[PDB]
Design a protein around this nucleic acid. Structure first.
Ligand code: MG
Ligand code: MG
Length: 133
RNA sequence: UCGACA
DNA sequence: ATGTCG
């Protein structure tokens, strides 16, 4: 019910789905952009949302921050929780990059620890997530 | 299919 | 329209 302003918010920006995917993380309070991923030619919205959360986890861990992460992606939150991105995107030559990033994200997750709460941003009550494009 | 999150 | 979960 309460927005934890002392947090990191992430979100994906896409052009087509499957289509070009990029993502960024911002300070929920100030909107300051803390990180951005170079656009990936082909990927799905959910894969980008997943990557955004995992990158967020790595970003906070490297800085010893215990701040939670907000994502408005039901799918990505579950994937991170299970440490498994159950994407249906075909694995082929043009989806090689997004899949490599997804695979490496899962890999990091299974080899590192964190207590970072991953919270659902309630868009229907609070409006667009702060990392929205 | 329905409901939901994008 | 397309990607995913409950
Ligand atoms: Mg989103
Ligand atoms: Mg949005």
């Amino acid at each position: 019910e309460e927005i934890i302003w002392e947090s990191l918010s992430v979100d994906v920006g896409s052009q087509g789905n499957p289509g070009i995917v990029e993502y960024k993380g911002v300070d929920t309070k100030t909107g300051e952009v803390l990180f951005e991923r170079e656009p990936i030619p082909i990927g799905t919205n959910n894969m980008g949302e997943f990557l955004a959360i995992v990158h967020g986890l790595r970003y906070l861990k490297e800085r010893n921050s215990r701040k939670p992460i907000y994502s408005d992606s039901q799918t990505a939150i579950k994937w991170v929780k299970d440490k498994k991105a159950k994407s249906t995107l075909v694995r082929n030559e043009e989806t090689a990059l997004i899949w490599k990033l997804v695979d490496e994200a899962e890999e990091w997750l299974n080899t590192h620890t964190y207590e970072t709460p991953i919270l659902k941003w309630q868009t229907d009550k609070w409006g667009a997530i702060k990392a929205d494009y």
